[PDB]
């Protein structure tokens, strides 16, 4: 004979009060199973008595990490103090129904007047909490703010991540998406620089013949203004652009003096210098990505970084998909991702598999094993020269 | 939906009151046909599948206005035999199946508590309040309503019961803690005006337990002081205020709230020659606070808000008023 029952869910814990309790001899009967199916014949059994939601996801996380371990929380003790009639079991008891046996023992030890029935032992309270878990969306919907699906989703993620310690040694997404960004904007830098090179050599065609390194081309067409306004070493720029006094600026200016290209307009020069500012901003962002990605690679997988070099190492990581996939692959699959060249390739694949599994399966990895394997590859590079 | 067969009982229950009203000369027969049709439409709306707390409240308001109309008409036609007990019983029935259907609606719970308090039902009010607190334990408004009505009744032990369970539950926001300190010091003022309690150590204990709560900010302690600073006409009020100031000074040394309580401390029970004396003391504290190393924009916004509170009162001198304006404008 049950009086109340606890029921804990991801939004909070609610205790129901049973009226017209379930038949215990005909629990395996088809009419009683159909009654437990239909909400119109199970809501006559249960009536919602109290509800306690969590204050925050931190409290829900503490709630699971206490309840699954077995120990009851202080706010569950609080809500039971509030909802149950205060007795001690000398002349009248209260039967509570709980899902877990350790929680049953602890609630009975905290409240001596409450006899708890566990769902793991008693079939009546098992079927009754089973029906409440069946209809739990509709029994709470008058005070169910939102849904239960996203709450269970986020709470299962928080519980699993707290059990696993996931975020402290899962770090590879920054590396693989940084490789994707680096290649995409390297292509975009080269394409925008080719476009500004053609569309400014239409105006001043000596700059393509006399100046390479298209980033420095974008800088000199940012600083040069028009064809008419040239002077060599005016202020702050060309001395640290390139050689200053006797080598380059004179040649650019005599190229402007003998220059024959089409005269450009002010608004067209404005648009070309806007495109050059765009290209050099993307180049500055490329060097910021390269520095930050070298630092992140030295934080995540330093052995692969020292045996391969960080661009090709992080390319290999991104093509494998993750460090866990890279470590699970053997050395021949890492070959997939004359004779001496293939021999050194196989040896490098073996040592790169060893470096990948060492750098992955550490908590916070090291440097010296990659240093040892790079010394081993260097002494093999010395070894193949004797023959 | 068996709603016709379900509402048949409530109409057959409301029928003999209509028979009494027809056999008296109070409602005529066409008006009683209108009452029958309106109660029938209301019952078939109430017992419908897809219903709403506003629908339950519309039915409650109609039945209560019918009771008021019949009271006016009965006093006008000079009858004393007709009683309001059947109407109050059916209004309690509407409210009970209302809180059965929608227990998660505090508007309907508070309307139920307002109705049960208005027709003089104290024990029923306490039972409804217990059920509402069990369903909405995180609601500071319900907890303060329970505690304040138990203090208004005078059962201070029951008021403390409701308030201590409320402070056990509602620990995210300071609101119920401030209201509990307000109710305990109002009990202290009642114990003074009736002339332990001689020490008045309970708001100091409330502060000492509130020091470790998840809302414990300097703004929250300033809210504690802004609660405490009212009704200064007591005995241990200087003890409580001084303990709050030394707690805030030992914990948050250079906060603008702590400098604000350093400004506004010595004006506890002043209204009168002791008023501008303590004002000159507080303005010395304020000038030292303005020159001192604190976030001056935050402290100045606090002081211009308190100075709007100052400017809200009449009966002062114009030189003091214009020097408040002069010190206000350059902030």
């Amino acid at each position: 004979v049950v009086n109340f029952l606890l029921f804990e869910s991801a939004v909070g814990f609610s205790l129901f009060e049973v009226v017209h309790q379930a038949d215990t001899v005909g629990l395996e009967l088809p009419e009683v199973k159909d009654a437990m199916k239909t909400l119109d014949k199970f809501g006559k059994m249960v009536k919602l008595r109290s509800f306690n939601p969590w204050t925050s996801a931190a409290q829900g996380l503490e709630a699971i990490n206490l309840i699954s371990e077995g120990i009851m929380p202080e706010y569950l003790k609080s809500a039971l103090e509030m909802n149950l009639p205060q007795t001690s079991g000398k002349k009248s008891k209260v039967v509570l129904g709980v899902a877990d046996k350790k929680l049953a023992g602890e609630i009975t030890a905290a409240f001596p007047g409450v006899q708890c029935e566990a769902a793991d032992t008693s079939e009546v309270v098992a079927a009754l909490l089973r029906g409440i878990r069946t209809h739990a969306n509709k029994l709470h919907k008058s005070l169910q703010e939102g849904d239960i699906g996203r709450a269970q989703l986020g709470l299962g993620h928080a519980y699993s991540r707290a059990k696993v310690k996931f975020s402290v040694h899962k770090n590879d997404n920054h590396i693989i998406q940084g490789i994707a960004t680096l290649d995409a904007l390297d292509k975009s830098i080269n394409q925008g620089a080719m476009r500004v090179r053609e569309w400014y050599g239409w105006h001043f065609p000596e700059l393509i013949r006399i100046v390479s390194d298209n980033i420095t081309y974008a800088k000199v067409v940012l600083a040069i203004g028009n064809k008419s306004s040239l002077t060599d070493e005016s202020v702050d720029d060309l001395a640290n652009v390139l050689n200053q006094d006797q080598d380059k600026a004179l040649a650019i200016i005599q190229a402007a003096k003998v220059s024959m290209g089409q005269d450009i307009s002010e608004v067209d020069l404005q648009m070309v210098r806007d495109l050059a500012s765009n290209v050099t901003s993307m180049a500055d962002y490329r060097r910021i990505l390269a520095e930050s990605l070298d630092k992140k690679m030295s934080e995540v997988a330093p052995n692969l970084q020292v045996i391969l070099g960080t661009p090709v190492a992080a390319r290999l990581i991104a093509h494998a998909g993750s460090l866990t996939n890279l470590a699970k692959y053997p050395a021949s699959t890492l070959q997939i991702l004359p004779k001496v060249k293939g021999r050194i390739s196989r040896y490098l694949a073996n040592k790169c598999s060893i470096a990948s599994r060492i750098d992955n399966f550490s908590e916070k990895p090291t440097r010296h094993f990659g240093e040892v394997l790079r010394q081993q590859l260097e002494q093999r590079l010395e070894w193949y020269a004797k023959g | 939906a068996w709603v016709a067969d379900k509402a048949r009982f409530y109409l057959e229950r409301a029928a003999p009151e209509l028979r009494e009203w027809e056999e008296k000369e109070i409602f005529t027969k066409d008006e009683i046909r209108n009452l029958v049709a309106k109660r029938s439409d209301f019952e078939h709306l109430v017992l419908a599948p897809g219903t709403k707390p506003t629908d339950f409240l519309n039915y409650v308001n109609w039945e209560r206005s019918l009771d008021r109309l019949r009271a006016k008409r009965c006093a006008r036609l000079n009858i004393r035999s007709v009683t309001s007990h059947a109407s109050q019983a059916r209004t309690f029935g509407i409210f009970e199946r209302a809180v059965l259907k929608h227990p998660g609606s505090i508007e309907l719970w508070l309307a139920y508590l307002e109705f049960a308090a208005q027709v003089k039902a104290t024990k029923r009010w306490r039972r409804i309040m217990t059920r509402a607190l069990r369903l909405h334990p995180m609601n500071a408004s319900l907890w303060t309503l329970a505690g304040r009505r138990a203090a208004q009744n005078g059962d201070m032990q029951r008021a403390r019961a409701h308030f201590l369970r409320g402070c056990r539950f509602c620990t995210r926001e300071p609101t119920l803690w401030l209201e509990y300190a307000r109710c305990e010091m109002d009990w202290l003022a009642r114990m003074e005006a009736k002339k332990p309690a001689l020490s008045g150590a309970i708001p100091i204990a409330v502060f000492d337990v509130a020091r470790k709560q998840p809302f414990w900010g300097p703004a929250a302690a300033e809210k504690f002081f802004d609660v405490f600073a009212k009704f200064g006409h007591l005995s241990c009020h200087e003890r409580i205020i001084s303990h709050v100031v030394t707690t805030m000074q030992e914990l948050f040394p250079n906060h603008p709230c702590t400098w604000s309580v350093h400004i506004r401390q010595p004006l506890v029970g002043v209204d009168t020659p002791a008023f501008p004396k303590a004002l000159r003391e507080s303005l010395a504290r304020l000038k030292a606070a303005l020159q001192s190393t604190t976030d001056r924009k935050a402290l100045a916004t606090k002081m211009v808000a308190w100075m709007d509170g100052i400017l809200a009162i009449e009966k002062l001198d114009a030189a003091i008023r214009t020097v408040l304006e002069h010190t206000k404008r350059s902030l």
């Binding site: 103090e81 | 607190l133 019961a161 201590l164």
Partner: peptide, 28 residues
């Protein structure tokens, strides 16, 4: 009877607040 919320005692006192308030009212 679980009709109303009974006044707390030292048996049904949970937190440090209720312990300290009951200690003060016991010393009263």
């Amino acid at each position: 009877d679980a009709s109303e919320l009974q006044p707390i005692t030292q048996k049904t006192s949970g937190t440090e607040l209720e312990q300290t308030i009951l200690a003060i009212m016991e010393e009263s």
